[PDB]
Structure 1
Amino acid sequence: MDRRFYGKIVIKGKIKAVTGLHIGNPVIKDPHTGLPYIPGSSLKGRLRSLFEILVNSRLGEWREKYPSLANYSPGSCRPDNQENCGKFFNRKINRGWIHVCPDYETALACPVCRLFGASGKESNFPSRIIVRDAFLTKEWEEKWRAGEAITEAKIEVGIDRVTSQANPRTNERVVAGAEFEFEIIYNVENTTHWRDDIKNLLTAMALLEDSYLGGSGSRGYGKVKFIFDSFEFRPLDYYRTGKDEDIVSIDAREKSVSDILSGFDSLFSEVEGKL
């Protein structure tokens, strides 16, 4: 009921890998250009899975602010084959358990499912962020042309203990240092709660800079480092006049934890006057 639209907060920037990355033994590449790239589903489905786990521990602190967290106890439906019950992860996809609130008004009240979207039986609430693919940057487009290898290979081994039987394989990783260019657009639909979802999306990004991005990750295959460039707002009046009436937020040398921390409320101050 009552889908609305005030604007689209655009989060441009550049994903940096200080340590070498892997997606998936080749890293998948853009076919028309040959370059590897970080997809959309590996960056939206990774932030959701570092935010459904974060919400799982904290169902006492968010329940006073978010309704429809009282409808779940922090748990898992993996042993007990029940669809919607007290345990927090409710949808068996085919064999996996992903927290999706099964209604519009549950997902309207849910802190996860108002942002990363939610399916349902005759409800089907749709998302508010759209996360685009990340190709190489235009200064790193040219190292492919200059032959400076945008990728590499890696030979590991797997040691059987008794006979010391070496069982090697060849991982193929993106080389450490290669820099992509990501894109997240937040679809501002409800002016009552967008202070949350901008400080709530950066929550999922900040855990990702401590965690890994795709690949194995527990061995070195992560280390995202979000280099932001500029938030803009794109109001509804931007799409009628076509002006540069999009409020620029200055974050040329700031971190994901340096926006969500002190410094937030002065940056987004003109957007609040624009609501």
Structure 2
Amino acid sequence: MTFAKIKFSAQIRLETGLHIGGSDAFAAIGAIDSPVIKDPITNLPIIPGSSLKGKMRTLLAKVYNEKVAEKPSDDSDILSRLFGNSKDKRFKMGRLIFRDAFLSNADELD
């Protein structure tokens, strides 16, 4: 099948409160909480693609490997094919590209 790119798009809606990332850099002066990963320019929460890829992959390993899978290098060809495998010549470059997701509905919430 000659080359093509299919773009899966959706809106992630948070059904409960979400907490991912961040550090004492992005922090507010006198914040006492565990802060969240934020887009630096808008100071809004962002859902990092690294997170989405990570979680989806480790969950999918439980389904699709039928193998121990001690390290991600050891995943099955079908998962390596999609998420990429640093130690396999064939899958060094993966067929999926996850993207940092940004908050749409600020106005709805306001």
Coarse TM-score class (shorter-chain normalised): 0.7 to 0.9
Does residue 8 (structure 1) correspond to residue 5 (structure 2)? The answer is yes
Structure 2 stretches lacking a partner, 5+ long: 22-33
String of CA shifts for 1:11-51, please: whole Å, max 9, x gaps.
01100111111102101110111110100100011111111
In the superposition, the TM-score normalised over structure 2's length comes to: 0.75
Q: Which residue of the other structure, out of 86, 91, 95, is the alignment partner of 1:119?
A: 86
Please give the secondary structure, in 1, of the residue aligned with 2:79. Answer: coil
Does residue 141 (structure 1) correspond to residue 106 (structure 2)? The answer is yes
String of CA shifts for 1:226-256, please: whole Å, max 9, x gaps.
xxxxxxxxxxxxxxxxxxxxxxxxxxxxxxx
Q: Which runs of 4+ in 1 moved over 6 A?
A: none
Q: Report 1:175-214 matches (<5 A).
A: none
- CA distance in structure 1 between the aligned counterparts of 2:99 and 2:52, rounded to whole angstroms: 9
Q: Which residue of the other structure, out of 6, 19, 22, is the alignment partner of 2:19?
A: 22
**1:42 aligns to what?**
51
RMSD (CA atoms): 2.4
The structure with the largest alpha-carbon Rg is 1
Q: Which residue of the other structure, out of 23, 38, 41, is the alignment partner of 1:32?
A: 41
Does residue 99 (structure 1) correspond to residue 99 (structure 2)? The answer is no
- CA distance in structure 2 between the aligned counterparts of 1:28 and 1:113, rounded to whole angstroms: 28
Count of aligned residue pairs for this structure pair: 97
Please give the secondary structure, in 2, of the residue aligned with 1:13. Answer: coil
Residue identity matched to 2:9: K
Report the identity percentage: 42
Structure 1 stretches lacking a partner, 5+ long: 60-73, 76-87, 90-97, 102-106, 149-275
TM superposition shift of 1:99: 2.3
Structure in which a larger fraction of residues adopt strand = 1
TM superposition shift of 1:5: 5.3
- CA distance in structure 1 between the aligned counterparts of 2:7 and 2:96, rounded to whole angstroms: 10
Structure in which a larger fraction of residues adopt helix = 2
TM superposition shift of 1:111: 1.1
In the superposition, the TM-score normalised over structure 1's length comes to: 0.32
Please give the secondary structure, in 1, of the residue aligned with 2:45. Answer: coil
- CA distance in structure 2 between the aligned counterparts of 1:117 and 1:18, rounded to whole angstroms: 30
